[model samples]
Target: MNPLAPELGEVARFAMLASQAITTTSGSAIVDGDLGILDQARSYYAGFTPGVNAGEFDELTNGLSYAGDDSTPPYVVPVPYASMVAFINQSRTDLGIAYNFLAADPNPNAATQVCPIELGNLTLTRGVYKTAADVTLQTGTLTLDGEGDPDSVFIFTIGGNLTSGAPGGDIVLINGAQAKNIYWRTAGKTVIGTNTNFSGNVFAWSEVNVRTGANVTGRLFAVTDQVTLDANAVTKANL
Candidate 1:
């Protein structure tokens, strides 16, 4: 009688023919994708709400925030830190993760999973990155900066936080509505709009805040931020 036999389900058998998921750090995933398998094992017991829309593009973009029906890009909104260890067991079992994928420093203690990003003038070409689980852009003065015209909208479908230290730290999403404050897709730390304006939504699980005096036209599903908006920040709907 194997003690752990009952625990390992059909997916754990590792029989290529029986397995239908392929886990990875890429921007896309298959049904029962590798992450899917791990997430199932960990959060199923604890009731972690990580998979908003499994095996599908978490969120895509159009000319603006939500322009067309299927114009948005796919995304990865990882489970909260409280449920990471449980959901990432197989990942611990497998050594296929990149160190960079790991948040350089994660303050899980904070209501939000706030971290720091230090990519000097970093310019992301605008694609999709299915985060291992949760992500935090901790860069104080870094930049995806801006491009020539209205660039593609970044889908924080797999929710996260973006902190800035530079004044007027502007982050223009090409075809944006000039709405400030990004949508926080997780129940973690999501800070933005320092020195300038926040032009996005914030769908946070725990806390959400904009830089002081920074204006936000978009909505905020914040658990917390540094504003006393009295409502009237964004349009509450599909965006």
Candidate 2:
């Protein structure tokens, strides 16, 4: 067996691991996806009742063991750093592999791209996209169409930050596109703007910030730093 197979295999496993909510080796502060105003005595500054299921993944926790509930905080139970760190290191290695794989794609649909896309409605198939600096989706929709194949993959290898920066910055999927198969591998931080809809599994080397009112249908992982959320909805889709 290839020596790297283990790392790759674990990546595939965690990519679809339902137990993994939002994991940060550093920390997390999540506040979003609330229930209704059944409790008629809550303050606006008090925010929504945080004692319930904010999502599958809560905040500021670690774990190899997975327990889930709607009204329960995901970070209530923490896992040992020794156990979780191993998986984190393996995932980082695999992320590098994926980044290199995308970079070497001879016929890539996009390469050496930068922020502020020139034309609107940039759609790509199963291929690689390379960017030297931060990648921002401004003034357009970046669509990843899987061509009706469930196993199709799309990767963005970013040398710097990754920002979904439009007032309505969006990542759209079509033709059998699944969030699990799309990846954004960044050497720096990542930011998902307010009121935007984003998809994909973000494997970042640093912090990840999902701003207020944003909706994410994928994983927000901050490998080295914290992940902050403000009144946002984060749901990691299954593979």
Candidate 3:
């Protein structure tokens, strides 16, 4: 709980990850609430909605607006867009880093549990888990139960690919669980499948690909590559 994730309000600045660039191909991707991105290049379309901070890219792109998937012009942000991009870059550096793999924990008696290679159909509680390889959830509802604790946190450090199966992957939170308290830190590329229900703040060393029609209620931040979105509804959590 070292302020490892972005603040709730700031989280809206990035409904999608941003490192080298931020690209959105889906006209149907409606990002509800405030949003920002750290990119040298942008592919945002007017067909999509950013509720706030919309045309910030144009301000950075020499006032030439990003061509929309449709023909409508996008709404611009209230603040200067270039400044927003700079702030995101500073925050990204502050949050990007890794902890030890075999570190000691608070509870001396608690046994170390290796995370499953594929995470699905299981009810997991608050804790820190690690995986030497990738973590996948395919065609099953992965539940995160907070046991009535809103402050309960879950941190998953993955070494390889972080992905979910298409059209059926899900992440369900129950019993006072808050998406604000979950972190998915991956050392590789991350992908969320189509029509999936995803939560938590995803921090990736590589890129993050969120497919069509997916609904996400958290944040996605990439430290290296681009974060691509297609037909997704990425809403910042109301913490």
Candidate 4:
């Protein structure tokens, strides 16, 4: 009789046993084993179980978790920050020294009036915008300069939907600290503004009208949307 086999059996039994304890969605463990087992067990069992079925991994992975109809968006950190001091010093004071984050910006509040934000599905970045204004793409060649680096991104909170047409080559900047919805649409090159570092990712729910010379810095994950590279629209790097 191999003693190692007995030990392995004991370990497996203990693992399933420890999973019986309760856990919060935040991913904390109060018991011994890996808490992932609890969720996995329910998933594996649902294959044979009736009624409520296990959700597809793809849907479960990114789909928002909800307790009811209207619930606050939980804290979801996509990046790994080193320290609190570094983040505050580097990013907090980014929108230039003149802009203040503590209190609201003076008179023409970019958030409401300037930035041209469209509530719900919109997201944004620093700078005083002029409301969700109708941005005419100069000549079917309007560009959203994220500047030099592609790291910069806008995260639109769900529920907000945007559309663009002819003289209607408009854009809605959806900026929110808690939500992510930075959909990029343009008639020309969308430069990831230089001299600045970007933080999240951008998702165009519709389509990315990329002009000839446009260069996107950050990664793109278009949901129900695609990107097009035009031949007619072309220009040199503004950087």
Candidate 5:
């Protein structure tokens, strides 16, 4: 069993997780470029009456303070707003632990695939796919098959950046594959292109960027930098 399994279990609940610096350095951990729809299916806290949706307008913007004079419908702070500061603080702590554990893992094994791999139109099965260089998926769909096992885990270890290019890159989960069981460990930045549908828990050493109109069903975690979001929707993955 992994030593950080408990910590990773805790992190599995988040739709978006960033380090303390990333969350505190800016007024909002998430900067919605277009004020688009953001949704989360998971509870912000394990204990709370009338569980607050962490991605809701009020909670997401830290009580509308991060909205910055964007006073309008859907941007207005709700009366008796439930602050998400505590939730963010806890996320920072847990993310730090999980990130460190993953970064320092000794048994990363060898690269299963070659460098500069292209995943477009490729259907991958449940396994650990490791690459020494960058990975890209451009103008096509990448399918992840779980072979009918809901618990099947797919891990991708990228020595370089991970890019899903614009105009098309999409991800499809089939055969009981769940976004929660997919893990992406990137040594560099992770970029999901415009209009792409991405699914995975990304643990990036650098920044994580979701371009305009992208939809993600898993968590975006930047271990040492910020997570940039543009007119996008992110739904928290279920454990």
Candidate 6:
């Protein structure tokens, strides 16, 4: 029974949205390397969307092209730029509200944890866990057990940053643990490593970087910066 469940649910509609720019790149020289949004549940909108500013559209479009090859076309679909701007602005406001709400309230029941916890080797139950510094998940599986309760909420509030170990970090939900009920709130940046499988909505104060070949089953919303994706699959979690 998280009070902000509805707000969180709404914000989860996008696979990834940022206040600055969302950049996609490929490792090798491949033409038209696709960056897939697996859910396709909501429209993609970013600060770099065309016509939001006078010259950003061109700049972003150029950046999206393959390195030194302008022949690679953009994947963006045409939409009203004004409407996209309005949508992004509203989303930014909502993200700010959620971030402030979670940051200000010190849940008395929340278990206070130390910084640099390795989540991959541990199994966490439903509740709130707060760390005053940074948190990391090394090479292993981090399981969330809901005790057969789908509505169970798991929140991790990190005062600094959240990082995942490269090439095998995974998060698995079990015993009715739902991704929609999982929230990761970080005061700094969130960096997901290569080929990791991640879950939960990441509310990052700075930026979110999903490295090559990772898969995310939640939203990555950056409050004040960018979200960089490199050939990753992001599927929006359902509420």
Query: Quick one: best TM-score, which candidate?
Result: 3
What residue runs in model 4 are displaced by over 4 Å at the alpha carbon? Answer: 1-111, 116-133, 137-202, 230-239
Question: What is the TM-score (0 to 1) of candidate 3?
Answer: 0.72
Q: Predictions ranked by lDDT, top down?
A: 6, 3, 5, 2, 1, 4
| Better by lDDT, candidate 5 or 2 | 5
Judged by whole-model lDDT over C-alpha atoms, candidate 3 comes out at 0.62
What ranking of all candidate models by TM-score puts the best one first? 3, 6, 5, 2, 1, 4
For model 1, what is the error of residue 204's alpha carbon versus the real structure, in angstroms, after optimal superposition? 1.0
For model 5, how many clashes?
A: 0
Would you give me the overall lDDT of model 4?
0.24
Task: Encode model 3's per-residue lDDT on 1-239: one tens digit a residue.
Answer: 32233333333444554656565664444343333344444453323333334454321221222211212234433344344344454445454532222122332333435778888888888776778798998958889888897877777778898899853579999987888778787888889998899998887778888887788877776777766777776765555
Inter-residue clash pairs, candidate 5: none
- TM-scores of the candidates are 0.35, 0.60, 0.72, 0.24, 0.66, 0.71
For all candidates, what are the clash counts?
45, 4, 1, 35, 0, 0
Tens digit of lDDT per residue, candidate 2, span 1-239? Answer: 10011123344434222112332222333322211111121121122223343223334122122222212233322233234334445455664554455435332334433323221368877655666667777567778788888767666767788777665478889998887777776778788887788888776766677776777776665555545566665555563
| TM-score: the better of candidates 1 and 3 | 3
RMSD to the hidden true structure, all candidates: 17.3, 9.8, 6.6, 20.4, 9.2, 8.4
Model 3: pairs clashing at backbone N, Cα or C within 3 Å: 13-36
Rate residue 43 of model 1 by lDDT. Answer: 20
lDDT of 4 by residue, 1-239 (tens): 10000011111111111111211122111112211112122322211112132221211221211111111132221124344233223322331121122112232322422433322223334333332232323222223334333433332222232332332233332222211213322222222221112222222333333333223322222222233333211111111
